[PDB]
Each structure stands twice: as C-alpha cells, then as structure tokens.
C-alpha cells in the first residue's frame, strides 16, 4: 500500500528568553523516526526508532548540518516576518512547516506537499502541480515573488519527486518489519447509573494501534448516530490508543444494544454488549 516521509518543523522566537527554538521531526508512514531540537546541549538529529540506529555517522552529520543551517535561517525568517507584518520585537512568534511525499504502492508520488504557517495560520503552500505557490495573505506574496524568481519550486519538486521518494525507500527497507505492526482493539462494555430509569453503556476500545477507529452503538441493526457521547481517540502512552462511545438506555433493556468496533486490524468488526460480572 501507500507510504510517506514528512518533516514537521517549528521555530519559535522567545525575546528575553534566549535564541529561538528550532525543532525538526521526521515521520515515516506517520511514525516519528528522527528528531532535532535546538534546545539540547549539543543539538543533533537523533534516531527515534531503533531501525534508524543503522545509519552511519556521515548520515547524522549531513542531517544535523541541514538542521543547524535552517535553525539559523529560520531565526532570520522570524525577524523578516516581524517586518512583513509590522510587529514589535518583544512578542513570541511561530513558523511551522509540513514537508514531504506520499507514494503509492507502485512507487509513484501521490502527493507532495510544502505548507507553511505563521502564528498558526496558513502562510504559503506549494500547489498540487508542484510548480506554483498559494500565498494566504499579502506578506506571503513577498515570499512567493522571492521564490518564483529563485526557481524554488523546481528545487523543491526535485526533492519531493526524487530525494524524498528515494530516502523513503531506504527508510522503509530498514523499518518495514517494525512499521508493519498493527494492534487490534480489545473491547469491553461498562455500565453506569443515570438519574431515574436510565443507564449509561460505555463501549471501550483499548490497546489498538493505528489511531483510526470507529465505534457505533445499535438498537436492533440501526445505528444511534445521535445521543451518543464519545471521546477523541487518545494515546495510552505505551504506543497504543484508546477510545470510547457511550449511549443512554432504559434500565432493564441493556441487552437490546450492541457496540460495533471498526478498525483496520479487525478482519471483521467487533460485536459486543453489556454483560454483568461473572
């Protein structure tokens, strides 16, 4: 199936608290595999997955030199944007970037992206054509003109279509056996009182990997796509995820409801209901 290599980059100014913080995090198929953080005593890209330990010192040096170089260039960018937006030197501001390639099973580029934000709002992005830019505001028009003159889209496209794709292939070779792991959700129903003649049934999905999951409650074979409470999917903290969905039902009618759990790791969706303790 499809794969991806993305870097999420953050630079945050901190007037009166020292130099700006620069963090770069790399992801393979949405999994963190390298990280650089300018706030370390000796800033360097570090492996964040065991399978990256294989890369020799020349790799880590080359990567670290790019990070330190861009740390300093992003420091300047922060000052540049203070001018573009006519802002004071006393406030903290953020530049964020998401860059990378999604490749299909056939090894062709499905999507290449390069998206910037300033203070949490869209700034500039490379278009789907990998040739032109979308500037979100007046300030980003200045950057756009600089980049169209510099032929930046062509340099970036080469990275996205070439370098990125080729390095993704290399990382996947080392990481595929680890990245492939999926943990299917284990599910159970809990029972809680409500006022009067109602009870809450809460369907739990625990221990699952890829975060993506759907929980539904049904009465008969019809989904209760309203009056059902749920939580955002959340990390257990051990690399697995949690979610729940609850419904309010009549006291005595608990056995009329069934919870449905849908996950990519499940060959068939889970079916369960409230069962009182053994």
């Amino acid at each position: 199936g499809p794969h991806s290599l993305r870097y999420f980059v953050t630079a945050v100014s901190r007037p009166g608290l020292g130099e700006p913080r620069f963090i770069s995090v790399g992801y393979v198929d949405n999994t963190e595999f390298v990280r650089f953080d300018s706030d370390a005593e000796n800033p360097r890209y570090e492996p964040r997955a065991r399978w990256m330990e294989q890369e020799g010192p020349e790799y880590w040096e080359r990567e670290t030199q790019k990070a330190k170089g861009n740390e300093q260039s992003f420091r300047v960018d922060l000052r540049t944007l203070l001018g573009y937006y006519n802002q004071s030197k006393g406030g903290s501001h953020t530049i964020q970037v998401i860059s990378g390639c999604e490749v299909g099973s056939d090894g062709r580029l499905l999507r290449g992206y390069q998206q910037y934000a300033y203070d949490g709002c869209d700034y500039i992005a490379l278009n789907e054509d990998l040739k032109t830019w979308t500037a979100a505001d007046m300030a980003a028009l200045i950057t756009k003109h600089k980049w169209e003159q510099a032929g930046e889209a062509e340099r970036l496209r080469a990275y996205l279509e070439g370098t990125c794709v080729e390095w993704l292939r290399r990382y996947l070779k080392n990481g595929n056996a680890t990245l492939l792991r999926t943990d299917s959700p284990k599910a159970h129903v809990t029972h809680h009182s409500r006022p009067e003649d109602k009870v809450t049934l809460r369907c739990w999905a625990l221990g699952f990997y890829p975060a993506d999951i759907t929980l539904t409650w049904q009465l008969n074979g019809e989904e209760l796509i309203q009056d059902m409470e749920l939580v955002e999917t959340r990390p257990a903290g051990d690399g697995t995820f949690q979610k729940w969905a609850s419904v309010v039902v009549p006291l005595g009618k608990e056995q009329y409801y069934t919870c449905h759990v849908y996950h990519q790791g499940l060959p068939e969706p889970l079916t369960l209901r409230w069962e009182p303790p053994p």
């Binding site: 530049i95 600089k146 370098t163």
Partner: peptide, 8 residues
C-alpha cells in the same frame, strides 16, 4: 532526509 529550506 531533510529538505534544506529557502528563506522567507
């Protein structure tokens, strides 16, 4: 492999 970013 990190992209070497241009300036804004």
């Amino acid at each position: 492999s990190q992209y070497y970013y241009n300036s804004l």
